[PDB]
Amino acid sequence: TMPRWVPLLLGLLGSTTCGMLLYAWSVFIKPLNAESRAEIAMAFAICCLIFGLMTFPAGRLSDKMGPRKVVMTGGVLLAIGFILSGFIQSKYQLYITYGVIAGFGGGMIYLPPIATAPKWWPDRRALATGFAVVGLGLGSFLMGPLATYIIEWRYVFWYCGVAMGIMALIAGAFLEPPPAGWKPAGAAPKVTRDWTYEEAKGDTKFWLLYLAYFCGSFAGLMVIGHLAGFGRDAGLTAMAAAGAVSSLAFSNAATRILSGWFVDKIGIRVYFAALFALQTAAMIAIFQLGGSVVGLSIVAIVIGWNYGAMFTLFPATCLQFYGPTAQGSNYGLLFTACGLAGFAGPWVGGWLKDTTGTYYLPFLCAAALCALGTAIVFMTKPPEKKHALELEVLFQ
Ligand SMILES: CCCCCCCCCO[C@@H]1O[C@H](CO)[C@@H](O)[C@H](O)[C@H]1O
Ligand SMILES: CCCCCCCCCO[C@@H]1O[C@H](CO)[C@@H](O)[C@H](O)[C@H]1O
Ligand SMILES: CCCCCCCCCO[C@@H]1O[C@H](CO)[C@@H](O)[C@H](O)[C@H]1O
Ligand SMILES: O=C(O)c1ccccc1S
Ligand SMILES: [Hg+2]
Ligand SMILES: [Hg+2]
Ligand SMILES: [Hg+2]
Ligand SMILES: [Hg+2]
Ligand SMILES: [Hg+2]
Ligand SMILES: [Hg+2]
Ligand SMILES: [Hg+2]
C-alpha cells in the first residue's frame, strides 16, 4: 500500500497549518491596531473556542466518513477564512472571518491526523501522535520571519491563507487509516476489544482526564502571556525579558516529539504526572527565578516543555485507555476541554492580575490547577479492557 511514515508527514503538514493559524494573530495585532488590543484579541478568543469545539464534530465525522474528507473540508474552510480575513473592514468582520470560519477549518484539520497517524504505528503510538501535533509549535519558525518581511498586513492574510489551504489539502488528500485487515508489521480464546465512543464518553476516567486537561490548559494559557511582563515587573528590560521568554517556543515544539518517544519507551502515567508536578513547581518558582534573564528562561523552558507535552500525552493516554478504533470521537470530545480553556483562561489571568494589581493571583491559581491535574493524572489508571463476547462465541 504505502510507507507508514507518510501519515507522519501528513500530520506534520496539517498541524503546521494549524500552528500558522495560532501564530498569525500575534503578528496582526500591531498592523490591525495601526488601522484596541483587547478588541483584536477577541478574534483569537473566538478562534480558540470554535477550533476546540469543532474538533468534536471533526472527530465524529472522521470516524464515520474517514479523515480525508474532513481534513480537506477544513483546508477549504480555513483557506477561505484567511483569504477573506484579508478583505476585512470591521471588527465583527475579523471575528467572523478568523475566529469562526478559520477556527472551524483549522479544527477539522487538526483532529483527524491525531486520530489517524498512530493507527499506522501501533508500536509507536505517542511518537505518531506527536508528529500529528508538533506543527503547532512550528508556526513561528516558518511564518514569522516572512510575516515580518511582508509587513515591513492584508498580504500576509491572503498569501499565508493560500499556502495553508494548499498544505491542508495535500495533508488531507493522502490521509487514511490502514486497510481494515492487515496491520503494518515487520481451548477458546478471550477476545478483548476497544471501547466504543458511547462507552468511553460515559466512563468516569474520561471525565477525570477531561478535568485534568482543562486544568493544565487553563493554567498554561492563563500565565504564558504574562511571563514577559513578570520579567519587566522584576526590573528586566522589555527586550531582555522578551528574549528570555522566547525559549519557551523551542521547548514547546521539542516536547511534542520527545515526550511521545519517552512515554513510548517507558509508559505515560508517571512521566505525565511528573510534567504536571514540574509545571506546578514552575508556577511557584517564578517568584524566585523570574527576575533574571537566565532564571526567567529556565521557567519559560520548563513551562513550555510541560504545556506542549499535554498535547501528545492526553491523546496518547486516551488511546491507551480506550483503544484506537474510536480515537477520533473520543479525542474530539476530550479536546473540547482545551477549547473552553483557550477561550476563557487568558482573560481570567488578565482579570486576576488587574484585580490585585499583582501576579500572585493568576500564578497561584494556575499552580493550584496544575496541582489538581497532577493528582488526577497520577492516580487515574486505565479501565478494564472490554470483553467481546459477541466475537468470543464464534470459537465453536
Ligand atoms: C471544565 C471542567 C469540568 C470537567 C468535568 C465535567 C463533568 C460533566 C459531567 O459528566 C458526566 O459524568 C457521568 C459519569 O461520570 C456521565 O455518565 C455523563 O454522561 C457525563 O455528562
Ligand atoms: C521531571 C521528571 C521526568 C520523568 C521521570 C519519571 C519517569 C518514570 C519512570 O517510572 C516508570 O513509569 C512507568 C509507569 O508509567 C512504569 O514502567 C514504572 O512504574 C516505572 O518504571
Ligand atoms: C481572592 C480571590 C480568589 C483567589 C483564589 C480562588 C480563584 C478562583 C478563580 O476562579 C477561577 O474561575 C474559572 C472559571 O472558569 C475556573 O477555571 C476556576 O475555578 C478558577 O480558576
Ligand atoms: O496545541 C494546541 O492545539 C493549542 C490549542 C489551543 C491553544 C493553544 C494551543 S498551543
Ligand atoms: Hg485564545
Ligand atoms: Hg485558533
Ligand atoms: Hg500544565
Ligand atoms: Hg485549546
Ligand atoms: Hg489563587
Ligand atoms: Hg484556580
Ligand atoms: Hg474550578
Author numbering: 7 to 41, 45 to 161, 167 to 200, 211 to 420
From the paper:
Both structures show SfMCT in the pharmacologically relevant outward-open conformation, which is an essential prerequisite for the design of L-lactate transport inhibitors using SfMCT structure-based homology models of human MCT1 and MCT4.
With an average inhibition constant (Ki) of 120 μM, SfMCT has a higher affinity for TSA than for its transported substrate L-lactate (Km = 233 μM). The carboxylate group of TSA interacts with the hydroxyl group of Y119 (TM4) and the Nη nitrogen atoms of the guanidinium group of R280 (TM8). The thiol group of TSA is in hydrogen bonding distance to the hydroxyl group of Y331 (TM10) and 3.5 Å from the isobutyl group of L28 (TM1). The side chains of F359 (TM11) and C362 (TM11) are within a distance of <4 Å from the benzene ring of TSA interacting via hydrophobic interactions.
